[PDB]
Design a protein around this ligand. Structure first.
Ligand SMILES: O=C(O)[C@H](CCCN1C(=O)N[C@@]2(O[C@H](COP(=O)(O)O)[C@@H](O)[C@H]2O)C1=O)N(O)CO
Ligand SMILES: O=C(O)[C@H](CCCN1C(=O)N[C@@]2(O[C@H](COP(=O)(O)O)[C@@H](O)[C@H]2O)C1=O)N(O)CO
Ligand SMILES: Nc1nc2c(ncn2[C@@H]2O[C@H](COP(=O)(O)OP(=O)(O)O)[C@@H](O)[C@H]2O)c(=O)[nH]1
Ligand SMILES: Nc1nc2c(ncn2[C@@H]2O[C@H](COP(=O)(O)OP(=O)(O)O)[C@@H](O)[C@H]2O)c(=O)[nH]1
Ligand SMILES: [Mg+2]
Ligand SMILES: [Mg+2]
Lengths: 431, 431
């Protein structure tokens, strides 16, 4: 298929960035359609490590035009810092990055509000990345927020910003008893980069429609993961955007009937960083092992991630919400050496019932217990292996079982962080 | 196709409800996926008129199960009133209506906030329907809002509601200098119907996936119109939800790859009710004529709608955002008698450029002027005509021109309000 979507089937950090960089060899465009700079996608080419946050993962390739769709909430400060660090590494960002004028802006008061609300939550804190993501989406839905297009008229932008900030400062000071945000600082900072942002503007929707008609290869890079979806995720312990495949359309302008192949990124075990339900969470030595061997630490905040076994019940939910075409199993190599590997196949509900579907809201996960299926591990190393043949039999059975429990084929298996430490059993573009 | 989506290509009130009722003869399910009770969809069967707002338009048919997906923001008070009025007319609503526990709730403070914000806007007022839609979507995105699922634990629901209302009352009283909302009134009212709402709950996402696998016919009924989209519409003069086809997935749980046919409802002329850009808006006698002959008055608020000529530039945008498969032309019959009919084919920008694409944000429409193409009308009546043969040649040319300028076929033509005053040139389910 020409239009391929890459997204996380779990709670983020499944290894989307790597797969995007690897697959954009044959793509003309790569599009981010939701989230903002809370995302941290790691790329490792020949040992060199790049960590992107806002800029699409196809930025290192000269043949690809990277696009930030309207679904993304843009921090002008975050972008400039990312653009700079990349330009210093020989990446002509400005030559390959385009963006939507419909993208809402994340300004200082948004970050302030984020911290304030989280402090007001106390123990019930969501555990946001503190980047002002949620507040920026609120201003959008409330129809009071500023977008990239507003930068086009600096006179009226100052009028609009003045009004919005008046509203937010009142609540910051009066309700949250916090420090007000300086209007002039924000006005100066933003205006000091307005021309750079507006020069990269393009009608993303029309462009994507033309690419579709020309048969160009387009890749949509997802942020966060399915269970963090604002609608279908573990509310309220979720991100404020739709992380599921439907977000591709609302966040880029591409008609849903043009999504050809949806590739779900699936890690061999599970992780979650921030508050919220997590049935297969390990607290023992095997947990510390997965964390240590997997190097599980937030690429954006540095928080150590929670680890656990693969949950096929939750994954099956990701299969249906996204109409997954195939999977890309990652971090198989971290499972090396373990005596046995488990995989949750059902949930025991607090009332005694054994279910095979997930609850929705966070409160409904409260007493859920995972029902495992134990499988033999392998001591042999699978790291860097680029052929099924190099995989121990136990690894192959583990892979086949996942396919069995899921009903979706694993088309790509990743065995290391480097771009080349992979094995594409099937290319989504060819399929 | 089995999964058919019906939505408005303009600014709402194109005649979606009628088409839904008419096409659900062969459907098992009908799903609302966004909006709330701001919608007013009229159905006329054998002269009897039904106006639904929240309940899907397939409610009059015994063979269809009506579903309110998670994308809909539900007013418990609006639902009860609608359910009652229908049950009095011999419609066993409770027997055929199911709903998502993920639907956010619209309570009294939401309506209060809506009125307050609109008064604070003054001249720049959006012109909302005052049903608390926007505020309810904000609470959702802010992750502080209550959902149907919360009604399941009345003890903790009172705790949650208390917190949220504390927040909103402070701003209502202190910032907006308005009247506070009584917590007990809300708590009593809501709790007085909790058991009715929770008894209708179903895991919509899983259900839709099963229907897909069984090959059941499913129809998605859209609310509002494309240009009112929160992302792609004339921001900030828009509704707070995604009215475009991508909203089908985020608002129901259905994977985007399963959308088979997207039918766009297209009125023969244009209307808009509320503030905002409208290039083809007529202010003369022809405008008053379209309004009068079309009976253009808000089905929800009673506001008289603004009228104008059909805008193919704006419609072409709706074609791409939704990946439209075909159109359903409605109200052709209102054009009867007119000497000539125009249809905007391009825009003259304030700087002199002639463009064929629409601007995005409302501020960018400011000086846009429509460039028409005049066509001969017809004095002969087309009302109730159920065969192309009964259509005057000028009508057929008008229809063919629209197809020419759009590149999308008109598969259904409506010639009157009654269910039977139609002509299906092609059924989306068979196509
Ligand atoms: O916390 C970090 O450092 C991130 C986590 C990435 C996934 N992720 C988010 O981007 N946001 C998260 O979703 C929830 C809402 O946070 P926010 O509103 O900031 O997006 C929190 O759990 C927050 O941690 C969330 O889980 N890195 O792992 C990403 O490389
Ligand atoms: O105003 C009415 O009586 C409605 C208008 C239906 C279309 N429509 C909406 O439902 N909302 C509208 O979108 C904008 C935002 O309003 P709201 O936030 O309440 O949805 C306003 O222009 C509002 O009028 C809008 O244009 N009826 O025509 C529907 O039968
Ligand atoms: N061992 C191992 N590490 C991997 C593999 N694929 C990706 N990674 C690493 O796992 C981490 C994935 O988390 P992150 O960078 O946040 O990924 P993303 O945000 O989902 O794209 C990165 O540090 C990668 O270098 C793999 O197959 N094996
Ligand atoms: N004359 C005429 N009226 C129609 C036709 N189709 C629908 N209508 C009427 O047009 C109005 C459509 O607006 P509304 O009821 O808000 O439709 P919806 O909300 O888009 O489904 C209704 O009052 C219908 O009875 C048609 O083909 N001809
Ligand atoms: Mg990450
Ligand atoms: Mg209506």
């Amino acid at each position: 298929g020409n239009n391929v979507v890459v997204l996380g089937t779990q709670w983020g950090d499944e290894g989307k960035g790597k797969i995007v960089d690897l697959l954009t060899e044959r793509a003309k465009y790569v599009v981010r359609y939701q989230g903002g700079h809370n995302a941290g996608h790691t790329l490792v080419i020949n040992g060199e490590k790049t960590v992107l946050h806002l800029i699409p993962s196809g930025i290192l390739r000269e043949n690809v035009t990277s696009i930030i769709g309207n679904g993304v909430v843009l921090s002008p400060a975050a972008l400039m810092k990312e653009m700079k660090e990349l330009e210093d590494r020989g990446i002509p960002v400005r030559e390959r990055l385009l963006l939507s004028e419909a993208c809402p802006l994340i300004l200082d008061y948004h970050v302030a509000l984020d911290n304030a609300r989280e402090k007001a939550r106390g123990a019930k804190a969501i555990g946001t990345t503190g980047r002002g993501i949620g507040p920026a989406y609120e201003d959008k839905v409330a129809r009071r927020g500023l977008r990239v297009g507003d930068l086009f008229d600096k006179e009226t932008f100052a009028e609009k910003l003045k009004e919005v900030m008046e509203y937010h400062n009142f609540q910051l000071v009066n309700y949250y008893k916090a420090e007000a945000v300086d209007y002039q600082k924000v006005l100066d900072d933003t205006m000091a980069v307005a021309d750079i942002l507006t020069s990269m503007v393009v009608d993303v929707s029309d462009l994507l429609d033309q690419a579709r008609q020309r048969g160009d290869f387009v890749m949509f890079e997802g942020a966060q993961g399915t269970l963090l979806d604002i609608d279908h995720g573990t509310y309220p312990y979720v991100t404020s955007s739709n992380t599921t495949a439907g977000g591709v359309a609302t966040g880029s302008g591409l008609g849903p009937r043009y999504v050809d192949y949806v590739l779900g990124i699936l890690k061999a075990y599970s992780t979650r960083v921030g508050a919220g339900p997590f049935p297969t969470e390990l607290f023992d030595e095997t947990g510390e092992f997965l964390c240590k061997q997997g190097n599980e630490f937030g690429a954006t905040t540095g928080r150590r991630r929670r680890t656990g076994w693969l949950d096929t019940v939750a994954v099956r939910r990701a299969v249906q919400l996204n109409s997954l075409s195939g999977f890309c199993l990652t971090k198989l190599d971290v499972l090396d050496g373990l005596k046995e590997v488990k995989l949750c196949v059902a949930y025991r509900m607090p009332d005694g019932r054994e279910v095979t579907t997930t609850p929705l809201a966070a409160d409904d996960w409260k007493g859920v217990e995972p029902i495992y299926e134990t499988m033999p591990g392998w001591s042999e190393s699978t790291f860097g292996v680029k052929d099924r043949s190099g995989l121990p039999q136990a690894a192959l059975n583990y892979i086949k079982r996942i396919e069995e429990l899921t009903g979706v084929p694993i088309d790509i298996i990743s065995t290391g962080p480097d771009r080349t430490e992979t094995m594409i059993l099937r290319d989504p573009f060819d399929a």
